[PDB]
Design an enzyme around this catalytic site. Sequence first.
Site, mmCIF file in Angstrom:
data_model
loop_
_atom_site.group_PDB
_atom_site.id
_atom_site.type_symbol
_atom_site.label_atom_id
_atom_site.label_comp_id
_atom_site.label_asym_id
_atom_site.label_seq_id
_atom_site.Cartn_x
_atom_site.Cartn_y
_atom_site.Cartn_z
ATOM 1 N N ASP A 102 0.803 -1.233 0.000
ATOM 2 C CA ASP A 102 0.000 0.000 0.000
ATOM 3 C C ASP A 102 0.838 1.286 0.000
ATOM 4 O OD1 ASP A 102 -2.526 1.231 -0.290
ATOM 5 O OD2 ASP A 102 -2.860 1.485 1.854
ATOM 6 N N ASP A 115 -3.339 6.685 7.698
ATOM 7 C CA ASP A 115 -2.769 5.382 7.982
ATOM 8 C C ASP A 115 -1.888 5.472 9.216
ATOM 9 O OD1 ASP A 115 -2.242 4.322 4.507
ATOM 10 O OD2 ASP A 115 -3.971 4.194 5.867
ATOM 11 N N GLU A 121 -1.370 -3.792 9.933
ATOM 12 C CA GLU A 121 -1.199 -3.705 8.503
ATOM 13 C C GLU A 121 0.043 -2.886 8.174
ATOM 14 O OE1 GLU A 121 -2.821 -1.451 4.940
ATOM 15 O OE2 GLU A 121 -4.663 -2.462 5.701
ATOM 16 N N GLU A 122 0.291 -1.853 8.971
ATOM 17 C CA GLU A 122 1.345 -0.893 8.657
ATOM 18 C C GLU A 122 2.729 -1.382 9.025
ATOM 19 O OE1 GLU A 122 0.163 1.512 6.955
ATOM 20 O OE2 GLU A 122 -1.865 0.674 7.344
ATOM 21 N N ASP A 182 -6.274 -3.689 11.131
ATOM 22 C CA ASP A 182 -6.142 -2.745 10.070
ATOM 23 C C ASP A 182 -6.489 -1.418 10.688
ATOM 24 O OD1 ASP A 182 -7.315 -2.607 6.664
ATOM 25 O OD2 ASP A 182 -6.304 -1.164 7.867
ATOM 26 N N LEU A 184 -6.517 1.668 9.518
ATOM 27 C CA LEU A 184 -7.466 2.380 8.689
ATOM 28 C C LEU A 184 -7.683 1.618 7.413
ATOM 29 C CD1 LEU A 184 -9.156 4.846 8.936
ATOM 30 C CD2 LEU A 184 -7.707 5.988 7.332
ATOM 31 N N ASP A 185 -8.740 0.800 7.366
ATOM 32 C CA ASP A 185 -9.162 0.132 6.141
ATOM 33 C C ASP A 185 -9.858 1.097 5.180
ATOM 34 O OD1 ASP A 185 -10.309 -1.979 4.265
ATOM 35 O OD2 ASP A 185 -12.183 -1.263 5.204
ATOM 36 N N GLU A 188 -7.955 -8.291 7.827
ATOM 37 C CA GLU A 188 -9.168 -7.906 7.091
ATOM 38 C C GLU A 188 -10.134 -9.091 7.088
ATOM 39 O OE1 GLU A 188 -6.721 -4.594 4.397
ATOM 40 O OE2 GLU A 188 -6.992 -6.623 3.727
HETATM 41 O O1 LIG Z 1 -9.632 -1.560 -5.145
HETATM 42 P P1 LIG Z 1 -10.219 -2.964 -5.201
HETATM 43 O O2 LIG Z 1 -9.403 -3.871 -6.083
HETATM 44 O O3 LIG Z 1 -11.665 -2.926 -5.650
HETATM 45 O O4 LIG Z 1 -10.170 -3.559 -3.715
HETATM 46 C C1 LIG Z 1 -10.821 -2.813 -2.710
HETATM 47 C C2 LIG Z 1 -10.381 -3.322 -1.352
HETATM 48 O O5 LIG Z 1 -9.168 -2.715 -0.958
HETATM 49 C C3 LIG Z 1 -9.200 -2.413 0.416
HETATM 50 O O6 LIG Z 1 -9.072 -0.984 0.507
HETATM 51 C C4 LIG Z 1 -8.015 -3.070 1.094
HETATM 52 O O7 LIG Z 1 -6.986 -3.105 0.117
HETATM 53 C C5 LIG Z 1 -10.529 -2.917 0.955
HETATM 54 O O8 LIG Z 1 -11.045 -2.025 1.907
HETATM 55 C C6 LIG Z 1 -11.405 -3.018 -0.284
HETATM 56 O O9 LIG Z 1 -12.331 -4.083 -0.252
HETATM 57 MN MN LIG Z 2 -8.140 -2.571 4.798
HETATM 58 MN MN LIG Z 3 -4.870 0.017 6.638
#
Ligand SMILES: O=P(O)(O)OC[C@H]1O[C@](O)(CO)[C@@H](O)[C@@H]1O
Ligand SMILES: [Mn+2]
Ligand SMILES: [Mn+2]
Lengths: 326, 326, 326, 326
Positions: free
Chosen positions: D59, D65, D88-89, D109, D111-112, D271
């Site tokens: 990422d 984040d 995650e970080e 995570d 910040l998801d 996740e």
């Molecule tokens: O951008 P994409 O390929 O649709 O994947 C989205 C996914 O990425 C994330 O941000 C984690 O990488 C999730 O929150 C989300 O479901």
């Molecule tokens: Mn996430």
């Molecule tokens: Mn994150």
Amino acid sequence: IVTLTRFVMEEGRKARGTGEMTQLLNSLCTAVKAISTAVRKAGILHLYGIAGSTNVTGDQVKKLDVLSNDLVINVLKSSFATCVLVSEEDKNAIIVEPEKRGKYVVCFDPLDGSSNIDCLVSIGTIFGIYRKNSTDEPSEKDALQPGRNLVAAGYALYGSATMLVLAMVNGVNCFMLDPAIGEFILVDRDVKIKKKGSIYSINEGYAKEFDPAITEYIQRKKFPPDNSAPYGARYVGSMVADVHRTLVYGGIFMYPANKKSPKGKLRLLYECNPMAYVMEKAGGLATTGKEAVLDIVPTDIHQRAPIILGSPEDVTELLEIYQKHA
Amino acid sequence: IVTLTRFVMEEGRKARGTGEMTQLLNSLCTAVKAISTAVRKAGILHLYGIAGSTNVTGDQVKKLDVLSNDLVINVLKSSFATCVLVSEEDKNAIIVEPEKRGKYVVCFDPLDGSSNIDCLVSIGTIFGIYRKNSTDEPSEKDALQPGRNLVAAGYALYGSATMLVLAMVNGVNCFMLDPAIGEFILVDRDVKIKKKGSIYSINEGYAKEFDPAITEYIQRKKFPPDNSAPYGARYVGSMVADVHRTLVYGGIFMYPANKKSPKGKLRLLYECNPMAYVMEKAGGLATTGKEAVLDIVPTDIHQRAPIILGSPEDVTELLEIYQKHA
Amino acid sequence: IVTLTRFVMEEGRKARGTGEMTQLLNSLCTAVKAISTAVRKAGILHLYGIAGSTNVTGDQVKKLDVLSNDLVINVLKSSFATCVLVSEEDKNAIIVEPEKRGKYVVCFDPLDGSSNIDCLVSIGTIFGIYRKNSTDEPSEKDALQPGRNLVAAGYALYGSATMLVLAMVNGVNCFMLDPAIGEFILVDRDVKIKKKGSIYSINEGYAKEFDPAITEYIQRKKFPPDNSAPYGARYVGSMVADVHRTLVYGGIFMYPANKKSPKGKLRLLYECNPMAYVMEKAGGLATTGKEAVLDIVPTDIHQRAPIILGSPEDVTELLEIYQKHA
Amino acid sequence: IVTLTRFVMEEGRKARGTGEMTQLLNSLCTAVKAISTAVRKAGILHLYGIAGSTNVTGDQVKKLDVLSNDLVINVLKSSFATCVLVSEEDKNAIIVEPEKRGKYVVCFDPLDGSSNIDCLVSIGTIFGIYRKNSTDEPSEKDALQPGRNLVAAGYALYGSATMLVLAMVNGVNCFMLDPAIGEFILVDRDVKIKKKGSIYSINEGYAKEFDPAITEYIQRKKFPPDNSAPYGARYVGSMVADVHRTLVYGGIFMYPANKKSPKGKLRLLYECNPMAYVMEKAGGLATTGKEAVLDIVPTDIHQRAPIILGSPEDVTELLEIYQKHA
Ligand SMILES: O=P(O)(O)OC[C@H]1O[C@](O)(CO)[C@@H](O)[C@@H]1O
Ligand SMILES: [Mn+2]
Ligand SMILES: [Mn+2]
Ligand SMILES: Nc1ncnc2c1ncn2[C@@H]1O[C@H](COP(=O)(O)O)[C@@H](O)[C@H]1O
Ligand SMILES: Nc1ncnc2c1ncn2[C@@H]1O[C@H](COP(=O)(O)O)[C@@H](O)[C@H]1O
Ligand SMILES: Nc1ncnc2c1ncn2[C@@H]1O[C@H](COP(=O)(O)O)[C@@H](O)[C@H]1O
Ligand SMILES: Nc1ncnc2c1ncn2[C@@H]1O[C@H](COP(=O)(O)O)[C@@H](O)[C@H]1O
Ligand SMILES: O=P(O)(O)OC[C@H]1O[C@](O)(CO)[C@@H](O)[C@@H]1O
Ligand SMILES: O=P(O)(O)OC[C@H]1O[C@](O)(CO)[C@@H](O)[C@@H]1O
Ligand SMILES: O=P(O)(O)OC[C@H]1O[C@](O)(CO)[C@@H](O)[C@@H]1O
Ligand SMILES: [Mn+2]
Ligand SMILES: [Mn+2]
Ligand SMILES: [Mn+2]
Ligand SMILES: [Mn+2]
Ligand SMILES: [Mn+2]
Ligand SMILES: [Mn+2]
């Protein structure tokens, strides 16, 4: 129901205004909301402490003094409404730059109640506004008008709640700040002070420096001669708080001349006159002991004056003493 | 850096607690945060007014009194930590129901400073806590312990900021409420009061009802005999505010016995004793004029007592007068 | 630095306005701040649920729909600025009463994104404004103007943050709401959309009801013929959110005519046209597939239209398909 | 009525806990409240932008984040409750220092939803918790337990509102954050997912990279063979948002293996597994397509896995396809 914004505009509309008195006021509100947010968590922002200086008037300057000052100087400026600013914190008048300039002069105590900051007692902001007279390039003189020339005056109280009290030709209205949506909601419309109360408010730490009238007066509050009950005593320490309690409960507030302050402590421009204007607009009085405050043509922008204000009957009872003696 | 929660737990951990002293305290905080939110906009919630009754102690009860009261009764209950509650608002002790019951007794002024609500002056909440002694079914008696039995005591100030001050065996800590995230952030760790200040705080509306010592004492503050400067006078009107200013600036606060209140005005259980405990824990004193407050075995839960507190040297100077006379 | 208020006034000043376009906008902001406060805790206010009715357009009406609706109707009214209101929630135009009336017509979706309320996805408010043409007593007709007549258009997003996006003749500016002081602080000045992005946003649940162009277009996003990478897919469910992401990231948003909705789903007056105006002002396009949205003279206030908008190159690539086919 | 604090304690009491599972959870809440406050005004804090790095997982790291990460690392630490943290970080497990150490392992995570920050779409925080098995000095291994070992799992949604959803052995409860008093108020007690919904949620930008089952499945949602209505399509872009909408509305969410990601995109530890645990606790399923997620013994802390979850009937319909094919 009614926000300050709305009330502003509806009252400024009926007076046929340009919107300029308006922009100004709304600018002031944002200033107040900002100050109030900081104050409600000033210790968590390390805003208690000194900023590191003495005033034109003598005050040991705190950071809150500074922040809140900058804010008002900022917001008044950007309003396009003003031309001269007089601040407690600023030695000389501030002359707005020509493109941002308006036809208004604004005097203000950016944060009244410094002795009360650290201990978390109530504090506030006081302001007055006059319309420009001179055609002169705007100078410091356009501030040296008496209180009877005020077009608007009020103050904000950051007490248990944050209140914005505002007086104009037609009367006094209180608006409270709802932190939740960041608006000032009208709480009291066209307020009036009681003809007589039962609270005297004074720093009796100067019992010894006081003159014969103040002395006689206090003694009468404590030893009522009609054998009635003795007035309650209150003295928060913060002009904005004591004036306000006087406003809603009635009674009298006092910061008289003493053997050391021929001219009392409070400043004419930005503590005394606005408080007097509010107060007269509510139906009470405001005197030096010897003359109405609003009739005093200032010669200096940082000049002080004594000040007696509150319930008309009380203020009168004491004017009589001042007479009885001089 | 440090939240009340964190500080709670780390200090309660080192004392080897069950977590019960803890649940309780955190319950209290939520109570405080809720009260504080309402207060900061009480006029916008129509919470100024009367709720419609007189207290066990005499007070003309306001809605805020009520709301804030219910809240504490609620939160203390659900904590599983307490067994007896004594409230200013409640005639009789409140005995927690058996399943929700804990081993703690909690006395509290849910909203101290009623005379100051409408005018938006500072107000607060005071509380004390004792561990249960009796094996008796929990009764009203488990409250009738002296102040030297307190395990925790403090109060919240809804002043210009909202502060939560808390004393336990090891000292006094101040936490301020950050409205933004709804947490109490430690602002002052292990606070101490000055050995002497320069502020006397008293309702001199009772000049006439006062005894010879109070009278002599005040006169000395106003006419210092070492020809030093006279103390400043302060009296907000709200016990929580004056006690607190005394705490951080030093000086003395006074609500003495008078010709009418053999026993002063303030209540032992929920105004006097907690304020005394805080105060002694900071290094100051708290006396009736005749005896420490914390040593007084109460016989009635709504009983009053005089109270002198603050800078030890000041409080002493006046204990001497009380001696000089009796 | 810059509040919406300030920016409003400085841009309205340079255009020489009466202040009326202004009052209006500021009224709208308060509306937004209020809606936003409720939304951020709508479940704690039991505002999820149904209010109990169907729209003129078909929607199963929620309480939030109602609250937020009333608010805007209120605030627009008290502004003295408007004469006709068109609301999603209201069958017929609303004609302001004569004393409160202004020269403005305001169409609005009080709360766009109903399918997204309960699950706490982003939702918002959309609005448009036209200057009154007729000298006719203000009727429903003064709303039936095309999009190229808009003087102001924008919407508020209550997303992870609350944003107020606003377009006028001179461009698009974003202001974010600082809950702390309840003001909208300029975050992006004079925004522009990318000439091409890589996100297509559409409810493909209608794959089957779609026409040959949409079908061909989607297939091209998924199977790029220049063998480039396939566009990302996004579809929040809330027009305000998808339009906005399109705004700042580029790409395309789609709610095309289908075999069942000759005229798509979204409403011309209060979803489609304002979004189109914003969008064209940023430098992107907005088409039915067959004609610009802003050129469509509405005949009915609740009328729908298809809508393709976003990066000009994308929107063009698809206009070509629509041609290739019809 | 019920705060997270209260509910925490009452459910942790009945399970006879030490209070340690508790301290931990409450620490987590403060973390969430802090993150949420920042997010609601992240643009006004210049928190959109890059912090300047790539993850262990790939990422492009944003300041949010970072902030949000530090916060959790902080709060989990000071809790005295944990011994190993997986973020995650953070490239490697974090081993709490011995004096601050507890018997818990926490994966999160912080910040998801990074792709959704700038455009103000919903984002959130996900976390899982396992009890320590080893007597080994706490190592990275104590994280490499399967999902069926989770004692607690949930996530916070900063959507239109801020929600804290939490699952433990006994079920799933939702608490919403009241910004006003900074507490989490129970909104939904013991939540269950519908046995079947009508929403499929997937990034169809990978139509081309998808396997034969996903392909067949989507086609069935769009061309229902029982000639029923075609499912609605939703894909916010933020795992926390889509999972949650799936939770309350029913339906299915999908991030399947594809020709490029043998192992899907989402991470197992922080996740996938918590979302699976929540989901199974509500009565839905969570599969790779080939095996339950919660049964997968991880070998790497940053390892990914496919993930199908939601309404049990839907998830089943698709497991059948995966069978039909392999
Ligand atoms: O951008 P994409 O390929 O649709 O994947 C989205 C996914 O990425 C994330 O941000 C984690 O990488 C999730 O929150 C989300 O479901
Ligand atoms: Mn996430
Ligand atoms: Mn994150
Ligand atoms: N909002 C207002 N409320 C009351 N009076 C106003 C207002 N705005 C303007 N006025 C009156 O009109 C005068 C000039 O208005 P203005 O043209 O805005 O400077 C002021 O001195 C006021 O007395
Ligand atoms: N959070 C705490 N801070 C300080 N002391 C505590 C705390 N919790 C418990 N104690 C001490 O331990 C005693 C009993 O704790 P408890 O078992 O929680 O009732 C109390 O009387 C306190 O003196
Ligand atoms: N705040 C403003 N910003 C931009 N343009 C404005 C503003 N106020 C007025 N105008 C312009 O002046 C016209 C009439 O202004 P008003 O007299 O306020 O109705 C409007 O149609 C606008 O195009
Ligand atoms: N607040 C709580 N809610 C539910 N279960 C809890 C709680 N606290 C402790 N437990 C249970 O007791 C176990 C150990 O508790 P503790 O002693 O606090 O670590 C945990 O694994 C939980 O399953
Ligand atoms: O400290 P003193 O002498 O009682 O004077 C208090 C006054 O000082 C002020 O802080 C301004 O100097 C006022 O707010 C207040 O009335
Ligand atoms: O009104 P008086 O007589 O000055 O007493 C004020 C006292 O009353 C209280 O409100 C409690 O009665 C205290 O907070 C305060 O110290
Ligand atoms: O539910 P659908 O068919 O995908 O349509 C979603 C649209 O509905 C709306 O809620 C208005 O009906 C828009 O905000 C959104 O674009
Ligand atoms: Mn000042
Ligand atoms: Mn002052
Ligand atoms: Mn009380
Ligand atoms: Mn009290
Ligand atoms: Mn709507
Ligand atoms: Mn809509």
